Amino acid sequence: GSETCIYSNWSPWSACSSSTCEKGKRMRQRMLKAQLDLSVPCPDTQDFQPCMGPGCSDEDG
C-alpha cells in the first residue's frame, strides 16, 4: 500500500471524465521516489477519485 512506497506529491488531476455536473471520475499518476522493498514495485503510481464538472457542487451530497 502506501507504507512500502514513498512517492512524490500527487500529480494534478486530468480532465474530469464527466465535463458536466453528472458524477464522474478523474485520473492522476505520481512518480515513485523510493521503495522500502526493491523486489516489489509500487503499482500505486496512479489513482482515480470521483469528480463533477464546472457549475456543480456537493451542496446536495
Curated annotation (Swiss-Prot):
UniProt-annotated location(s): Secreted, Extracellular space, Extracellular matrix
Disulfide bonds: C5-C42, C16-C51, C21-C56
Tissue-by-tissue expression: Expressed at high levels in the floor plate.
TSP type-1 domain segment(s): 4-57
Superkingdom assignment: Eukaryota
Primary role: Cell adhesion protein that promotes the attachment of spinal cord and sensory neuron cells and the outgrowth of neurites in vitro. May contribute to the growth and guidance of axons in both the spinal cord and the PNS.
Subunit relationships: Binds to the central extracellular domain of APP and inhibits beta-secretase cleavage of APP.
Entry protein name: Spondin-1
Species in which this protein is naturally found: Rattus norvegicus
Whole-protein coverage range: 441 to 499 of 807
